[PDB]
């Protein structure tokens, strides 16, 4: 995946978030620290926060990441698109996990109710574990795919099944 | 915290895999043709067992005492979904699901290669995404989980232009 998309993946609370532009940061709702009153040197009062279940978007009053260009964020992707989940793991290892996207679903994962775009990992037959699949620490990692020359981002990692074979992408 | 990924090591024109502290396996054509020592050990003290495009090195001291011994078998049953553990010079880890078929002699881009046939499950073309293999990937290992155990069953030897068909070189 291009160096420019890996530069947008930022360690955040108990998981990750993604810079769409200089002023727009998206994450997974449950990774946000519940007491936090300041983000990147800016108070709560100076930040626009749109929340839809497990998807949260922050828009700031000034350019946090002026090194960045605005890119396309969409409400999920067509059924059968293959995406990469841009996962950072221990020691500057970068894990772009291949996933085949399916339909909008509502599910129960280990007691919690989750809603988003379901997908199946293309890494192996049994994704359970950290070598071939996801860990709770990967929440907020972005779902991206290439189309006609450009790259699109279409959600953030919300959950994975007991077996690890199914993941859920929270969408706008 | 143990990891399979720690066993994948840069070697000659590609990669190799540590099966145990004393046992390293790779693709025969990536091995350097001019050499006196490999991992600090003089070739003097290295057993080399070649079977076509599969080579095994057994060292006379523990090069990786941090590792336990793993199960190595001569290929896997037909229809087993394996994972090819590709490391890139970018710092990327790319585990791709492959459906293994029959032992075969294959025309792959001009040349004849003997090993276990497989088909990538990412989709007929990777068009710019991390969904297929490149020449530099040769020597990467084929693994799958079976009960409580990882099995390694050979090394990445070749792939077709379209990238659909792959050959896993096996012990024999
Ligand atoms: O669905 C899969 C592979 C699914 C699979 C994964 C693990 C074990 C068994 C099966 N590929 C696909 C990609 C692109 C397409 O267009 C169609 C299919």
Swiss-Prot record, chain B:
- Show the disulfide pairing: none
Substrates-to-products reaction catalysed:
Endopeptidase with a preference for cleavage when the P1 position is occupied by Glu-|-Xaa and the P1' position is occupied by Gly-|-Yaa
Top-level taxon of the source organism: Viruses
Q: Which residues form a coiled coil?
A: none
Q: Where would one find the signal peptide in this protein?
A: none
Q: Where is the active site?
A: 29, 53, 138
Domain Peptidase C37 as annotated: residue spans? 1-172
Q: What functional role does this protein have?
A: Processes the polyprotein. 3CLpro-RdRp is first released by autocleavage, then all other proteins are cleaved. May cleave polyadenylate-binding protein thereby inhibiting cellular translation.
Q: How does it assemble?
A: Homodimer. Monomer; in solution.
The protein, known as: 3C-like protease
Please give the range of the full-length protein represented by this chain: 1101 to 1272 of 1788
